[PDB]
Amino acid sequence: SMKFGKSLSSQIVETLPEWRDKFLSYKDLKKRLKLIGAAMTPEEAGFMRLLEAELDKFNSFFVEKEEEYIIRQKELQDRVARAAGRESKEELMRVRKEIVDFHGEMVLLENYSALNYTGLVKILKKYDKRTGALIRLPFIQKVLQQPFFTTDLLYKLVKQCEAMLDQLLPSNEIFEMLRIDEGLRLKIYKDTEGYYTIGIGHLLTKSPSLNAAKSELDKAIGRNTNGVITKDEAEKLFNQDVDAAVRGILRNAKLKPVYDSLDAVRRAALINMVFQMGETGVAGFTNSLRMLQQKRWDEAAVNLAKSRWYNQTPNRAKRVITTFRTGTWDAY
Amino acid sequence: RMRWTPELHERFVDAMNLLGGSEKATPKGVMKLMKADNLTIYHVKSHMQKYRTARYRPGGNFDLTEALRMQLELQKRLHEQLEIQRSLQLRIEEQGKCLQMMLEQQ
Ligand SMILES: O=P(O)(O)O[C@H]1[C@H](OP(=O)(O)O)[C@@H](OP(=O)(O)O)[C@H](OP(=O)(O)O)[C@H](OP(=O)(O)O)[C@H]1OP(=O)(O)O
Ligand SMILES: O=P(O)(O)O[C@H]1[C@H](OP(=O)(O)O)[C@H](OP(=O)(O)O)[C@H](OP(=O)(O)O)[C@@H](OP(=O)(O)O)[C@H]1OP(=O)(O)O
C-alpha cells in the first residue's frame, strides 16, 4: 500500500496557516476527473487549466519560501558568527532550537514538493486512463523541470544549516568512534578476561563477586543502578576515562611530544589505541610515533599496518590508521 | 517572482547597509546599487519586507537538547530519503518512456 491521500492530509494538518491550500488539491482533482468522459474537449482543457494553476501555485510558493530561507540562513549565520562560542546556557539553547527548527522547515518544503509530485503522477495516470490520451509522459517531463520538483538550491541551504549545527550542537566524536570500535553495553558484562565491565570498556573490578562490581557502579554514577545504566551515564563515565587517558599520555615522555603535535582528530585515534592496548603498548610504536610527530601521515600508515595489532583487530586498526592518514572521521 | 540566490541576497545587504540600513534605505536606491539582471522595484520591496520581518528586534534543558538531537536526526533521515525519492521518480518516468517507445513499435 501507498496511502497517499491520508499521508498528504496528515502533512497539511501539521503545517502553519500560510501553507493553507498551498499543497496539491488532490481530493478536488479526483472529483473533477469524474467530469471527464485543438482536438481537446472543453472538459479536458478545463482540467488541464486546473493542473497548470496547481503548478503555478507550487512554483510561486516554493521560490518565495527559498527567498525567506536565504534571508533566514544569512541572519542565523551572522548571529552564530557574532557570538563566537560565547553564548550563555539560555542563548545557546535559543539559537540551537531556531536552527533545528529552520532545518525542519526546509525539510518540510522538500516534503511538500515530494507529496505534490507523487499526487500529480496519480492524477495524470487516472486522467490518461479516463481520456485514452497519452499526456502523462510530456506533462511530467514539464514538471521534472519546474523549480518545486528539482529542489533548486534548497539542498545547499540544508547542507549550510547542517554545517552550523556540526559546530553549535556537536556530537561526542570520540564517544561515537569507540562505541563502533569497542562497543556500548548498558548492563554489567564480562570482558575477554574474567572481570566485570560496563559501557565502553569501563572495568568496574577484577573481583569475582557481582555485588563488588555493583557497589563500584553505584559509587561511579552516584545512584542505585542495579547493574543497568543509560546512554548519558555511560557517556559521562567514558568522558572521565578519556580525561584520565589524556592525563596519562601528557605525563608519558614517549607519548606527550607526539600527542601535543597531533590535531584534535588524530589525538582521538591515539586515545583509541591507548584504550585498546594500554599506554605501555602504544609507547612501543617508537618509529610509527616519530612519523606521526613529523606529520608523515602515509609513512606512519604503511608502518602501523605491519604491526601485530593490525592482524589482531584489522577492522578497528584500519579505521584508526585511516584517521591518522586523513585527519577526518570519514572512516567512522 | 525572482529566484534569489545567497550571493544575490549578500549583495542586497551590502547595498542597503551602504544606504544606511533597512530603516533608511529605499527600494529605488538598492535597485540602483545592485544593477542586477531582471531585478525589479517590486522584487526589492518584497525582499526588503521579508528582510525587515526576519530582523525583528523583540525535566531540564539537557532533555530539551536531547529532544533537538532526535528532531535533527529525524529531519536528516527524511531529507536523505527525499533525495532518494527524487531519483526513484526520475527512473519511473525513464522506464515509462521506454515502455511507450517499445509498445508503439510493438
Ligand atoms: O465525502 P462525503 O463524506 O461522502 O461528503 C460528500 C462529498 O463531499 P467531499 O467528498 O468533498 O468531502 C460530496 O460528494 P461526492 O462528490 O464526493 O460524491 C458532496 O457534494 P455532492 O453534491 O457532489 O454529492 C456531498 O454533498 P453536500 O456537500 O451537499 O453535503 C457530501 O455529502 P454526502 O455524504 O451526503 O454525499
Ligand atoms: O480505504 P482506505 O484505507 O481509505 O484507502 C483507499 C484505497 O485502499 P483500498 O483500495 O485497499 O480500499 C487506496 O489505497 P492505496 O492505493 O494507497 O493503497 C487508494 O485508492 P486509489 O489508489 O485506487 O485511488 C486511496 O485513495 P488515495 O489515492 O487518495 O490514496 C484510498 O481511498 P480514499 O483516499 O478515497 O479514502
Numbering used by the authors:
A (entry chain B): 0 to 36, 63 to 357
B (entry chain A): 248 to 305, 329 to 376
What did the publication describing this PDB structure actually write?
To understand how SPX1 responds to InsP binding, we determined the InsP6-SPX1-PHR2 complex structure at 2.6 Å resolution using single-wavelength anomalous diffraction. The final model of the InsP6-SPX1-PHR2 complex contains two copies of the InsP6-SPX1-PHR2 complex in the asymmetric unit. A highly crystallizable T4 lysozyme (T4L) was fused to the C-terminus of SPX1 to facilitate crystallization and improve the quality of crystals. The SPX domain of SPX1 consists of two long core helices α3 and α4, and two shorter C-terminal helices, α5 and α6. Interestingly, both the MYB domain and CC motif of PHR2 make direct contact with SPX1. Specifically, the PHR2 CC motif long helix interacts with three helices of SPX1 (α4, α5, and α6) through several ionic interactions and hydrogen bonds. One InsP6 molecule participates in crystal-packing interactions, while the other two are each captured by an SPX1 molecule via a highly basic surface groove formed between helices α1, α2, and α4. Three lysine residues (K29, K147, and K151) and a tyrosine residue (Y25) from SPX1 contribute to the interaction with InsP6. In the crystal, we notice that the SPX1 helix α1 residues M1, K2, F3, and K5 also participate in interacting with InsP6. Remarkably, superposition analysis of our structure and the Arabidopsis PHR1 MYB-DNA complex structure reveals a severe steric hindrance for DNA binding by the SPX1-bound PHR2-MYB.
